[PDB]
Amino acid sequence: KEIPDVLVDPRTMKRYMRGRFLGKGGFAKCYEITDMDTKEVFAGKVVPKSMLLKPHQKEKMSTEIAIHKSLDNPHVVGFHGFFEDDDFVYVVLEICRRRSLLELHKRRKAVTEPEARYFMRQTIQGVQYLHNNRVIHRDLKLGNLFLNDDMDVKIGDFGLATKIEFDGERKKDIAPEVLCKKGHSFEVDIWSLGCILYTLLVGKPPFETSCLKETYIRIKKNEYSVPRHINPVASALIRRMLHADPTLRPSVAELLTDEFFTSGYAPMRLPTSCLTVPP
């Protein structure tokens, strides 16, 4: 199935011109799309109906779209509408031309402490908004923290996001709670954030190994080592964020007010040079 040059929808009746290829993920291709009337650029997510044959797969996406539709926050990827077609499902999103924190990390390795502060603060502010709206991301990673031209963090990929419907709800359908199938809520996002902060400051993920089975065992037994080179203040925060007990992990609200975010220089802006070299 060939993707149309002009993407049209019955609802808004706006015309989107399919342009520059931006990348793919899980056989879902993404393109730089331009509104043929207003001339504003968006990231057009194109996913084929041949991938969503099973009603199980149709659902997921419907939950993903529903959750993302509700969201509006300067640190969450802007959702600007979706529409079906004969062959494809098109999702219109805020465009992030500067890839993700994963591409930055692979190029930079261990970043400077002030950079970690900047990136984490914006990400946590994003996660706080999600948690205040009873949304758990569940898949927070460097590859999901997208960057725009101004180097602002935008959280995306809600393909594993859920809504907490009631108080004290534990979910059964990566943190130790999920691997043990014991039940989880908001504190799985804090765990992931701890992994991210570790990876930014150290240069490598805390549980990474060549074997997938060995990685899961280390998570279960809480086997990681924050190197001696890391600032004790940052080291203390990581250990609390990655606590074996989900209850002893800090809430998203007390993350911002931690010593780490107040002890040293916290830049309010970052230049695009941080993609390749230290500032």
Ligand X SMILES: *c1oc2c3c1C(=O)O[C@H](COC)[C@]3(C)C1=C(C2=O)[C@@H]2CCC(=O)[C@@]2(C)C[C@H]1OC(C)=O
| Minimum CB distance to ligand X, residue 32 (Å) | 9
Cα angle 145, 148, 164 (rounded to 5 degrees) comes to 40
Catalytic residue list contains 139: yes
Q: For 15, phi and psi rounded to 5 degrees?
A: -105, 120
| Closest CA relative to residue 154, chosen from 95, 111, 105, 194 | 95
The sign of the torsion formed by the CA atoms of 171, 204, 217, 239 equals negative
Give the whole-angstrom CA distance, residue 152 versus residue 125: 12
146 vs 261 by CB, closer to ligand X:
146
| Minimum CB distance to ligand X, residue 141 (Å) | 8
225 vs 276 by CB, closer to ligand X:
276
| Minimum CB distance to ligand X, residue 209 (Å) | 22
| Closest CA relative to residue 261, chosen from 128, 146, 145, 99 | 128
Contacts of 142 (CB under 8 A, 6+ apart): 100, 101, 102, 104, 105, 196, 199
Q: Is 22 annotated as a binding residue?
A: yes
Q: Is 45 annotated as a binding residue?
A: yes
Q: What is the DSSP letter of 275?
A: G
158 vs 260 by CB, closer to ligand X:
158
Which residue, judged by CB position, is nearest to ligand X in the bound state?
A: 25
Give the whole-angstrom CA distance, residue 200 versus residue 194: 10
| Minimum CB distance to ligand X, residue 42 (Å) | 9
Cα angle 228, 232, 234 (rounded to 5 degrees) comes to 105
| Minimum CB distance to ligand X, residue 167 (Å) | 30
155 vs 237 by CB, closer to ligand X:
155
Q: Is 96 annotated as a binding residue?
A: yes
Tell me the DSSP string of 35-55.
Answer: ETTT--EEEEEEEETTT--SH
Q: Out of 139, 157, 189, 258, which one is annotated catalytic? A: 139
Residues engaged in binding ligand X (CB under 6 A): 22-26, 28, 30, 43, 45, 77, 93-96, 99, 143, 146, 156-157
20 vs 24 by CB, closer to ligand X:
24
> What are the binding residues for ATP?
45
Binding-site sequence positions for ADP: 22, 26, 45, 94, 96
Residue set of the binding site: 22, 26, 45, 94, 96
Active site residues: 139
